[PDB]
Amino acid sequence: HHSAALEVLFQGPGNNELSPVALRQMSCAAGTTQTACTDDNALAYYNTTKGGRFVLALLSDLQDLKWARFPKSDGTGTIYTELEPPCRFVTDTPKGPKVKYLYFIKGLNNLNRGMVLGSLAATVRLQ
Amino acid sequence: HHSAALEVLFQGPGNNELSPVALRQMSCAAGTTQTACTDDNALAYYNTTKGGRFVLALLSDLQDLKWARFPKSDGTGTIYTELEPPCRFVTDTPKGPKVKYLYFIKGLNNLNRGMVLGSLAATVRLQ
Amino acid sequence: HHSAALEVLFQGPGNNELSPVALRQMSCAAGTTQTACTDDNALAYYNTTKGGRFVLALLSDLQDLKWARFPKSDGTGTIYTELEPPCRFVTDTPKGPKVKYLYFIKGLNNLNRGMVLGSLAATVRLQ
Amino acid sequence: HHSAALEVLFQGPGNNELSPVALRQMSCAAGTTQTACTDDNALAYYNTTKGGRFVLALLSDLQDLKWARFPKSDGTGTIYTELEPPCRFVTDTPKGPKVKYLYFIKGLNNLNRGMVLGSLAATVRLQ
Amino acid sequence: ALEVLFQGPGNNELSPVALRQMSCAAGTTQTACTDDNALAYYNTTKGGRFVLALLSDLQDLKWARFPKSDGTGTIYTELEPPCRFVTDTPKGPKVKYLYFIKGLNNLNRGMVLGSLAATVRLQ
Amino acid sequence: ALEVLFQGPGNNELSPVALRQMSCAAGTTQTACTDDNALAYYNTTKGGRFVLALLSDLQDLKWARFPKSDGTGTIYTELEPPCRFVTDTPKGPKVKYLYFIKGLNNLNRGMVLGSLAATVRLQ
Ligand SMILES: Cn1c(=O)c2c[nH]cc2n(C)c1=O
Ligand SMILES: Cn1c(=O)c2c[nH]cc2n(C)c1=O
Ligand SMILES: Cn1c(=O)c2c[nH]cc2n(C)c1=O
Ligand SMILES: Cn1c(=O)c2c[nH]cc2n(C)c1=O
Ligand SMILES: Cn1c(=O)c2c[nH]cc2n(C)c1=O
Ligand SMILES: Cn1c(=O)c2c[nH]cc2n(C)c1=O
Ligand SMILES: Cn1c(=O)c2c[nH]cc2n(C)c1=O
Ligand SMILES: Cn1c(=O)c2c[nH]cc2n(C)c1=O
Ligand SMILES: Cn1c(=O)c2c[nH]cc2n(C)c1=O
Ligand SMILES: Cn1c(=O)c2c[nH]cc2n(C)c1=O
Ligand SMILES: Cn1c(=O)c2c[nH]cc2n(C)c1=O
Ligand SMILES: Cn1c(=O)c2c[nH]cc2n(C)c1=O
């Protein structure tokens, strides 16, 4: 349904084991408030487990986002997730440098924030 | 002196800006005891600093390592540097799979641990 | 196979959701070193996922433990897990107060340590 | 003045000793805005302190709360206390299931968040 | 200034660093960041300044405006909820509020708190 | 003593507290904790003392022996690996090692570092 994006290493299933997981990415609608989430304007990175999707972070050209909208598990409605203030970084593209803003989901711990930052740094070409 | 290894993103120079940094790698001598830190048996990932090197983690084929003895040029404040218990992960060699052990330096914070894990996951062929 | 012990609340499967999980408990052999893990002398609290068991903490009458021994996923051998230094607490029993030592597994984060402490405090009768 | 609610274990008086403490509960006034903090609409879990009360979390039927206004007797250093985004969890009522929202006080550390989650999980009928 | 100890340049070495202060316009909202009403404590970096914390007489601040010459990624930085502390001054006690920048890690929050406690006459 | 700021007794209030010092026998192993060779900084608690950190001239310590009158759960407490810092004294610079007690949280580690940096003449 959606494409693989950022590889990470989660602990488990046993103690002191690491398992590789591909975070997937999907287009999503974000905005300054829930009802401003209309047109797709961001890319969300998420993990999938049996119970559904867990979103870790969003990338966007826009710097004023605060909320993102996602489909619920099994087309059963809508979910809204609150965002942290963004960090700015610059990518290298065929059109020149492109400024991006990285938003973590509120309530993401620092280990997982770091895994997103490192896998992004290693995967996308940076200016 | 040594090769670039893992790309990461550090905040700075100011608030909410991310800047790319390549961690580098060098061979180093680790051991189950401080006296056993003799011959190179691990790869250290480090950030260059003004007047030294800050090591984040070691990668080894060996289990049960507890200490590393880094060269004086690193500028460590103690002769021996202590390791955390290793994380086991499996790489994809041309010869099949190979089990590796990742040892964080004691005290490394969770954001930086995560950045190493995500950059490693995105940079090396896994399974 | 083993009995339910400590209820906790893990985040997921979606963002900002909590799911109740019963940690289970099993007798295990612990000791000052791996080969000293012979007779059962501790109780281990663990979570089960598809890939196997993840141990969070041990309880014992003994205060000098450093290692614990566990069966591998699917009777495929033995696992050894390193322990943090213990904390002492006192329970209330039909034989009077009983001193216990709680050992977290090395590499357990503070959120999960707290969940063990709180669920223990609420589940066992304390002196 | 108020009833005991959630048992936890705090380290002290000295290193490596755990002492039981009952967090207590009282009704409190929360709101989406500071001005809306009017009538009691949440339950606060707190630790009694010499000269005040330290609130760890609020439980509410309501979503979208952001602030609480605690009584002067709590000894808060600011008029309004800010809440984290809530965690959703489901209790088992005689009437069926009931969705509740758990709001940690902003800044509560991970150990103490975990102790609240584990004590709650062990103390209330869940699902 | 507030003296702190940062690890580096090698592992397990501590180097003393002075956090410096600059005036700062903060506010309940970004649009209200119009006039200097706080002191921002920062670490000088190659190419800029990283702000750790603000001190103010006001307890309702949420956003701060920093100079782009800090090497910032955004004009505004969000603040954590403030903590109250009371200084002992010759003109009597004075109530202040300490704000960490949003997301500052706990080691660095602690260093500001400890440096403040040892540097300023408190009560 | 090292002054720090603890939160409480209510939310978002900061209260100044002096960490006091006592002599401490530490060692590479518990059995080697035979003679005072470190200074332990502690917070006084109802019923005891909670040690946060040790200072020593030695860089190889791993365990510390505390008095049971501290209200401890065990005689010995493990130490984190030390960090080196250099004090500026009239008799010249002197190298010291700072050890946190195992598991001290990062806020409290930071408070010790910041208080130390502001209290002691360093370099
Ligand atoms: C930190 N942490 C947990 O608490 C988990 C509980 N079930 C699965 C978990 N995983 C993969 C994890 O990383
Ligand atoms: C508490 N806990 C668990 O139950 C886990 C199950 N798989 C991975 C886990 N991790 C990392 C964890 O911390
Ligand atoms: C957490 N943290 C710090 O404290 C720093 C101090 N100088 C540079 C720093 N960086 C890049 C950082 O990430
Ligand atoms: C305290 N502090 C600093 O001084 C920094 C300088 N560059 C990046 C920094 N970060 C993230 C930080 O926390
Ligand atoms: C913190 N954390 C994680 O990173 C997880 C990755 N897969 C499942 C996870 N769970 C349940 C968790 O709690
Ligand atoms: C990164 N991550 C995940 O992928 C999760 C999947 N289920 C629960 C999760 N949690 C809490 C998390 O942090
Ligand atoms: C982390 N931490 C502290 O800093 C304390 C200071 N006085 C009492 C404390 N307790 C119980 C605690 O857990
Ligand atoms: C700094 N500090 C203290 O002062 C404590 C007093 N009782 C328990 C304490 N704990 C866990 C702590 O970290
Ligand atoms: C936590 N942390 C870091 O990540 C740093 C990266 N470069 C310099 C750093 N410093 C001083 C620091 O404290
Ligand atoms: C990851 N990392 C670094 O690169 C550092 C460079 N100087 C100091 C550093 N510290 C404390 C750190 O954690
Ligand atoms: C983190 N923490 C705690 O958990 C406390 C419990 N009683 C007193 C406490 N104090 C002062 C503290 O700082
Ligand atoms: C959980 N908890 C408490 O009970 C406290 C009592 N006084 C201060 C406290 N702090 C900072 C805290 O986190």
Side-chain angles (χ1 to χ4, degrees), chain A residues 2-127, chain B, chain C residues 2-127, chain D, chain E, chain F:
Chain A
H2 302 293
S3 317
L6 297 179
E7 196 79 15
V8 299
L9 282 160
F10 287 123
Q11 184 177 189
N15 294 273
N16 315 310
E17 269 158 24
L18 296 169
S19 297
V21 171
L23 303 182
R24 313 199 79 73
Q25 57 173 58
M26 59 185 289
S27 289
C28 63
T32 62
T33 193
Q34 292 93 331
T35 55
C37 295
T38 54
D39 297 315
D40 284 350
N41 58 5
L43 187 72
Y45 299 112
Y46 64 95
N47 187 26
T48 292
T49 67
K50 209 160 59 82
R53 289 167 177 166
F54 189 93
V55 180
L56 285 84
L58 263 60
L59 225 42
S60 178
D61 289 354
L62 310 170
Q63 77 174 90
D64 66 352
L65 309 173
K66 185 159 212 293
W67 287 92
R69 180 197 79 200
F70 300 97
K72 204 154 322 172
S73 38
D74 274 288
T76 177
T78 292
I79 293 297
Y80 286 99
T81 67
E82 198 174 353
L83 310 173
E84 303 281 20
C87 277
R88 181 184 176 283
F89 71 104
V90 184
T91 65
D92 196 349
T93 83
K95 293 203 221 323
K98 304 282 191 52
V99 172
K100 300 298 183 171
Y101 295 92
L102 173 66
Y103 299 79
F104 291 113
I105 302 308
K106 275 203 186 263
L108 193 68
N109 70 24
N110 284 330
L111 183 69
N112 286 323
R113 287 180 195 226
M115 290 209 298
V116 171
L117 285 161
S119 174
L120 192 67
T123 302
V124 313
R125 195 39 240 171
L126 306 157
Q127 201 58 237
Chain B
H1 277 359
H2 307 282
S3 304
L6 297 173
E7 197 74 14
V8 300
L9 281 159
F10 285 122
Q11 197 178 177
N15 297 82
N16 317 311
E17 175 71 8
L18 294 171
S19 297
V21 168
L23 305 179
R24 314 193 74 82
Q25 61 183 51
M26 62 188 189
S27 304
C28 68
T32 294
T33 63
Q34 300 180 343
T35 300
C37 292
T38 49
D39 296 56
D40 287 344
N41 56 6
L43 195 77
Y45 297 115
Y46 65 92
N47 187 23
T48 68
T49 66
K50 185 32 212 183
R53 302 180 174 109
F54 187 93
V55 177
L56 287 80
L58 272 55
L59 193 58
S60 189
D61 286 356
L62 312 182
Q63 297 190 227
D64 308 307
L65 304 172
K66 192 157 161 201
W67 299 99
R69 179 185 45 60
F70 297 124
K72 294 312 211 164
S73 62
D74 279 25
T76 60
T78 61
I79 299 170
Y80 300 97
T81 307
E82 195 175 351
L83 309 177
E84 304 272 21
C87 314
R88 174 194 193 276
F89 75 102
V90 186
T91 63
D92 200 351
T93 182
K95 194 203 121 93
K98 182 178 188 169
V99 184
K100 306 292 287 193
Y101 296 93
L102 179 66
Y103 297 81
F104 287 108
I105 303 303
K106 262 206 190 284
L108 194 67
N109 71 28
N110 279 324
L111 184 75
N112 288 326
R113 286 178 198 240
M115 290 213 294
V116 171
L117 289 165
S119 192
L120 186 68
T123 302
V124 315
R125 202 165 143 142
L126 287 170
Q127 59 160 76
Chain C
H2 302 293
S3 317
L6 297 179
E7 196 79 15
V8 299
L9 282 160
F10 287 123
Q11 184 177 189
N15 294 273
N16 315 310
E17 269 158 24
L18 296 169
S19 297
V21 171
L23 303 182
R24 313 199 79 73
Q25 57 173 58
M26 59 185 289
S27 289
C28 63
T32 62
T33 193
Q34 292 93 331
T35 55
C37 295
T38 54
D39 297 315
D40 284 350
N41 58 5
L43 187 72
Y45 299 112
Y46 64 95
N47 187 26
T48 292
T49 67
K50 209 160 59 82
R53 289 167 177 166
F54 189 93
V55 180
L56 285 84
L58 263 60
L59 225 42
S60 178
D61 289 354
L62 310 170
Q63 77 174 90
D64 66 352
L65 309 173
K66 185 159 212 293
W67 287 92
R69 180 197 79 200
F70 300 97
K72 204 154 322 172
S73 38
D74 274 288
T76 177
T78 292
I79 293 297
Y80 286 99
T81 67
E82 198 174 353
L83 310 173
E84 303 281 20
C87 277
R88 181 184 176 283
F89 71 104
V90 184
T91 65
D92 196 349
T93 83
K95 293 203 221 323
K98 304 282 191 52
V99 172
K100 300 298 183 171
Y101 295 92
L102 173 66
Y103 299 79
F104 291 113
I105 302 308
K106 275 203 186 263
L108 193 68
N109 70 24
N110 284 330
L111 183 69
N112 286 323
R113 287 180 195 226
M115 290 209 298
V116 171
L117 285 161
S119 174
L120 192 67
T123 302
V124 313
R125 195 39 240 171
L126 306 157
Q127 201 58 237
Chain D
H1 277 359
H2 307 282
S3 304
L6 297 173
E7 197 74 14
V8 300
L9 281 159
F10 285 122
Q11 197 178 177
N15 297 82
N16 317 311
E17 175 71 8
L18 294 171
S19 297
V21 168
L23 305 179
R24 314 193 74 82
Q25 61 183 51
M26 62 188 189
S27 304
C28 68
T32 294
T33 63
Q34 300 180 343
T35 300
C37 292
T38 49
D39 296 56
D40 287 344
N41 56 6
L43 195 77
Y45 297 115
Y46 65 92
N47 187 23
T48 68
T49 66
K50 185 32 212 183
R53 302 180 174 109
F54 187 93
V55 177
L56 287 80
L58 272 55
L59 193 58
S60 189
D61 286 356
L62 312 182
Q63 297 190 227
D64 308 307
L65 304 172
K66 192 157 161 201
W67 299 99
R69 179 185 45 60
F70 297 124
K72 294 312 211 164
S73 62
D74 279 25
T76 60
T78 61
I79 299 170
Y80 300 97
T81 307
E82 195 175 351
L83 309 177
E84 304 272 21
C87 314
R88 174 194 193 276
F89 75 102
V90 186
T91 63
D92 200 351
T93 182
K95 194 203 121 93
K98 182 178 188 169
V99 184
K100 306 292 287 193
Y101 296 93
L102 179 66
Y103 297 81
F104 287 108
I105 303 303
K106 262 206 190 284
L108 194 67
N109 71 28
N110 279 324
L111 184 75
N112 288 326
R113 286 178 198 240
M115 290 213 294
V116 171
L117 289 165
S119 192
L120 186 68
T123 302
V124 315
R125 202 165 143 142
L126 287 170
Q127 59 160 76
Chain E
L2 295 172
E3 199 76 12
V4 301
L5 282 162
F6 286 119
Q7 192 180 180
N11 295 88
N12 302 292
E13 169 69 15
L14 292 174
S15 296
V17 170
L19 300 182
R20 310 181 95 62
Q21 72 176 224
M22 61 177 166
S23 300
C24 182
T28 58
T29 67
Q30 295 174 4
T31 64
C33 293
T34 61
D35 298 273
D36 290 342
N37 55 6
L39 292 185
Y41 287 84
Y42 63 88
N43 183 34
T44 301
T45 59
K46 175 162 72 233
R49 302 178 174 177
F50 188 89
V51 178
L52 287 81
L54 269 60
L55 298 177
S56 187
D57 292 348
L58 308 168
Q59 74 173 269
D60 63 357
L61 307 172
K62 184 57 58 187
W63 290 94
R65 184 180 174 118
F66 300 148
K68 294 235 306 180
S69 64
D70 285 10
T72 48
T74 62
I75 293 275
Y76 300 99
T77 293
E78 190 172 13
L79 308 174
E80 302 287 0
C83 279
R84 180 181 178 281
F85 66 103
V86 184
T87 65
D88 193 349
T89 89
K91 294 203 291 282
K94 293 314 199 135
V95 177
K96 308 289 203 172
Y97 299 92
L98 174 69
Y99 299 78
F100 297 116
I101 60 95
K102 176 120 177 130
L104 190 68
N105 73 28
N106 283 332
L107 185 75
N108 290 324
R109 292 184 198 213
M111 291 213 292
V112 172
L113 288 159
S115 192
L116 189 62
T119 299
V120 186
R121 184 61 160 221
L122 290 187
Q123 59 160 255
Chain F
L2 295 172
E3 199 76 12
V4 301
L5 282 162
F6 286 119
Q7 192 180 180
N11 295 88
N12 302 292
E13 169 69 15
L14 292 174
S15 296
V17 170
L19 300 182
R20 310 181 95 62
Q21 72 176 224
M22 61 177 166
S23 300
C24 182
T28 58
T29 67
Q30 295 174 4
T31 64
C33 293
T34 61
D35 298 273
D36 290 342
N37 55 6
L39 292 185
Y41 287 84
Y42 63 88
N43 183 34
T44 301
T45 59
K46 175 162 72 233
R49 302 178 174 177
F50 188 89
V51 178
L52 287 81
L54 269 60
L55 298 177
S56 187
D57 292 348
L58 308 168
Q59 74 173 269
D60 63 357
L61 307 172
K62 184 57 58 187
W63 290 94
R65 184 180 174 118
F66 300 148
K68 294 235 306 180
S69 64
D70 285 10
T72 48
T74 62
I75 293 275
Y76 300 99
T77 293
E78 190 172 13
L79 308 174
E80 302 287 0
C83 279
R84 180 181 178 281
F85 66 103
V86 184
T87 65
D88 193 349
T89 89
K91 294 203 291 282
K94 293 314 199 135
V95 177
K96 308 289 203 172
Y97 299 92
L98 174 69
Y99 299 78
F100 297 116
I101 60 95
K102 176 120 177 130
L104 190 68
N105 73 28
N106 283 332
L107 185 75
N108 290 324
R109 292 184 198 213
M111 291 213 292
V112 172
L113 288 159
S115 192
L116 189 62
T119 299
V120 186
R121 184 61 160 221
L122 290 187
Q123 59 160 255

